[PDB]
């Protein structure tokens, strides 16, 4: 189910994915058309008891599902012009596996949310954290350029 859903979540088939998981859990969970709650409701049925090996198990992939869907939901809402709804799911991203390249990008994303709302001093927080934790600090300095453009700090912008 995890693997199937990863294909459908690489291939933008979220309507079919939620349908699969609605079928899996009780179909009484028919109206929870949000994924980010169905993925958490979905319970791996064992600690994977003494059977053959695996390279990866149900939970270990559920943990990838939740972070991947959260990140994707967030970026779509941000570009679509909801730098209000982003903040919820972009906090669900860091709360569950965030390999540090996923945190770097979640933080640029939250810098962008706040810059679009007109909250520059909060955005600066998340962007300095992204500078620190990241090995690729292009996308944050870009976000900073756009911040100083929004304000008019043209010397700061140019230096960024």
């Amino acid at each position: 189910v995890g693997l199937q859903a990863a294909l459908w979540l690489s291939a933008d088939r979220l309507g079919d994915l939620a349908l699969l998981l609605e079928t899996l859990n009780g179909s009484q969970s028919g109206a929870s058309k949000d994924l980010l709650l169905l993925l958490k409701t979905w319970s791996p049925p064992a600690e994977e008891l003494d059977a053959p090996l695996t390279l990866q198990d149900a939970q270990g992939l559920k943990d990838v599902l939740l972070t991947a869907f959260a990140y994707r939901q967030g970026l779509q809402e941000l570009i679509t012009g909801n730098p209000d709804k982003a903040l919820s799911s972009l906090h669900e991203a860091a709360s569950g596996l965030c390999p540090r390249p996923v945190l770097v990008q979640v933080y640029t994303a939250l810098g962008s949310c706040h810059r679009k709302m007109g909250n520059p001093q909060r955005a600066l927080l998340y962007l300095v954290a992204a500078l620190k934790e990241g090995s690729a600090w292009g996308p944050p300095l870009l976000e900073a350029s756009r911040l100083y453009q929004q304000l008019g700090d043209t010397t700061a912008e140019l230096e960024s």
Partner: protein, 89 residues
């Protein structure tokens, strides 16, 4: 037994302030223990509501202190293992 809390200052290299207190007295017997009363006997005394029983376990036990660093992840499975696998109240 009777109990002594000894105090000494460290700052002043005079050894000046070597106060004490006599902090009470502990009477005990097999008549008392035969009816519990100070014991901790496990699982019935799961729900810990006289905090001295918590404090007794944090005094008696073998304490061991650790750092956990995940340097290319964040670390949150703790609470699940604690709450779900280990099943912590």
């Amino acid at each position: 037994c009777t109990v002594l809390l000894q105090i000494m200052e460290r700052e002043s290299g005079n050894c000046p302030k070597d106060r004490y207190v006599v902090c009470g007295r502990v009477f005990l017997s097999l008549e008392d223990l035969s009816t519990g009363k100070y014991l901790l006997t496990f699982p019935k005394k799961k729900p810990i509501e006289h905090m001295e029983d918590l404090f007794a376990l944090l005094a008696a036990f073998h304490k061991s202190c650790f750092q956990i660093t995940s340097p290319g992840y964040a670390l949150n499975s703790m609470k699940v293992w604690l709450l779900e696998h280990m099943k912590c109240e």
